[PDB]
Structure 1
């Protein structure tokens, strides 16, 4: 079977250095908040063009912490795309803020900036942008609304490592940014991992303390914090792979281009890349989505849906189930992700295209 995402193929490239670094860490006797974390932070901050990177435990923790650090009041509002992955929302509700869900543009799969302002109220305190599937969101009007209404901009960068907008990288487009380095991310760890990026010295220092039980200095707790740290081992593996991240994204770009140039099937709506797209996911759209996934599985092609139930329709968010979000709803009914990975072989991506072209429904 062709895997959706063959992480062994992706990581095998680095095994020798993974084992060297692991042995270096064993020799150091230091496994938490050490030289590897510092090195990776400094390199990832450089990569994103930001002053400060704080290694944390995962992408949801990254968001949760950013919101926490802003000390919003219970029920304050955070504008967010309605079609993002549920963890973007969980971060908001975990802080007892209210998610205000906005429809995406069908031609980007990202928040439609034109639909935000109408939803801003006295309680709105932040906009969470999500660079979904790999494509950076059009920030122009979002930044204008943030300045106009005194809103924080929070970036969810879990799916768009390295994507660029004008002169900047995702991670440097708002006030603070959360990354996942979950193993399937464009920069993936060998375990759970994440980070927070910002230019604000004071916010950075708060965040560090907050992710370390609320302790800035040994023995002392300035805040009621969490334990959300990036392990030395994972920092070291990330730093190894970071050197190849733009290359790996360019290998995705190549595959996505092959798909775009070769899949010709009237039942399939292909993704476009209006702005920079690092192609974490290659998302097609069809009225016969389940049929297509079954067909592809018959042809030994593994696929995953991102995503078939939207946050507002989840059982955990019963109070949202009534919201009318037909664009988001229709997307969740229609999308399927095609295998794409930096290391994916030409014969595999050729086969995917050929089998999709043969789909006659």
Structure 2
């Protein structure tokens, strides 16, 4: 009867209703709604969660990336290697600093930056690499780091889709990393509105960020540098604190589901599945499949009362937004292929097994018929 929802947000509030309500009531009653104890508590907790020393809360994953770059001196004339395969914000953030986004294709087997391709894209104007741990899968960080070192580049990770994921046993955002996260409601760790953060081991970068996000000031009405307004609300921070506490458990639920999908969709002719890189603990922000006749598969599922989505329908390079400025069509085949064949299957910490089985059955069904 009822459809399989793509991702149930309300279920996330439902599960922790009492604590959530109390957290909000608390904020409401504090009389402090910006840059207070909730933000400070969350930052500390998140940073620790991430196995690093600093966290700076902001308004969105897009701002975190932008401010991270700006904070590393990134600007006009600079080149930033970005994924040709990712959510547009990745590029926009770069574009926002005046810098130039230079797309690099994903590895042939994993939706992350291909390091060898990366190397070949590096030019004398390159100043930073911007790997995206797409769908909750970590990019080959050791290879990226080697490259960056060897070439004197910074590394800003787009971890908006990988909260709590591990790379070779270390969380994404650990140590000397510089990673941007999104707290958008639908992210693996979400709140009740827009939010984001930058995590880093660098106390200096951290401080620049604190100024950056707050009108370039550390002291009221003391504008030492040009800044903006990109803060994480206390109210949102409060909830985030609750949710963080449940992140590994929630994440584990997705992993189970992912294991279910992998086995249950194994063999299917014409249906490509995700190949987890070794030495990694992905967080399955999205469970993706690939096929020719993706459109037909979606309709089929739709018709079967299954909610689906495509991440993403148009490759960044081909969006009107960047059209006249990025590589021509056919010049980024992998991102292009992804756009035509990819489909996201319901997944989340509130999806019941029976519903995942329904999904599987319907996929097999279609797969089989075609």
What TM-score, normalized to structure 2?
Answer: 0.95
CA contact (8 A) 2:62 2:182 kept: yes
User: Which one of 294, 316, 328 corresponds to residue 322 of structure 1?
Assistant: 328
CA contact (8 A) 1:163 1:278 kept: yes
Within the alignment, does 1:292 sit opposite 2:297 as a pair? yes
Deviations along 1:186-228, one digit per CA (max 9) or x if unpaired, are 1111100100111111110110000001111112111110100
CA contact (8 A) 2:76 2:99 kept: yes
CA shift, 1:174, in A, is 5.6
CA shift, 1:167, in A, is 3.9
Within the alignment, does 1:306 sit opposite 2:311 as a pair? yes
CA contact (8 A) 1:252 1:341 kept: yes
CA contact (8 A) 2:60 2:195 kept: yes
Within the alignment, does 1:348 sit opposite 2:355 as a pair? yes
CA shift, 1:305, in A, is 0.3
| Whole-angstrom CA distance in 2 between matches of 1:96 and 1:294 | 41
- Specify the SS of the correspondent of 1:101: strand
| 1:10–1:27 distance in 2 versus 1, CA, 3 Å | closer
User: Which one of 234, 258, 263 corresponds to residue 256 of structure 1?
Assistant: 258
User: Which one of 198, 208, 213 corresponds to residue 196 of structure 1?
Assistant: 198
Alignment of 1:26-105 (within 5 A): 26-105=28-107
| Whole-angstrom CA distance in 1 between matches of 2:44 and 2:61 | 18
RMSD over equivalenced CA pairs, Å:
1.1
CA contact (8 A) 1:153 1:174 kept: no
Number of matched pairs: 361
- Once the two structures are overlaid, the 10-residue window that deviates more, 151-160 or 271-280, is 271-280
- Once the two structures are overlaid, the 10-residue window that deviates more, 282-291 or 69-78, is 69-78
| Whole-angstrom CA distance in 2 between matches of 1:128 and 1:146 | 11
| Whole-angstrom CA distance in 2 between matches of 1:10 and 1:108 | 29
- Specify the SS of the correspondent of 1:53: strand
CA contact (8 A) 2:185 2:191 kept: yes
| Whole-angstrom CA distance in 2 between matches of 1:174 and 1:76 | 22
What TM-score, normalized to structure 1?
Answer: 0.98
Alignment of 1:201-280 (within 5 A): 201-264=203-266, 265-274=268-277, 275-280=280-285
CA shift, 1:90, in A, is 0.3
Alignment of 1:140-159 (within 5 A): 140-159=142-161
User: Which one of 103, 124, 130 corresponds to residue 132 of structure 2?
Assistant: 130
CA shift, 1:81, in A, is 1.1
| Whole-angstrom CA distance in 1 between matches of 2:175 and 2:95 | 23
- Once the two structures are overlaid, the 10-residue window that deviates more, 247-256 or 20-29, is 20-29
CA contact (8 A) 1:152 1:175 kept: no
- Specify the SS of the correspondent of 1:294: helix
- Specify the SS of the correspondent of 1:96: coil
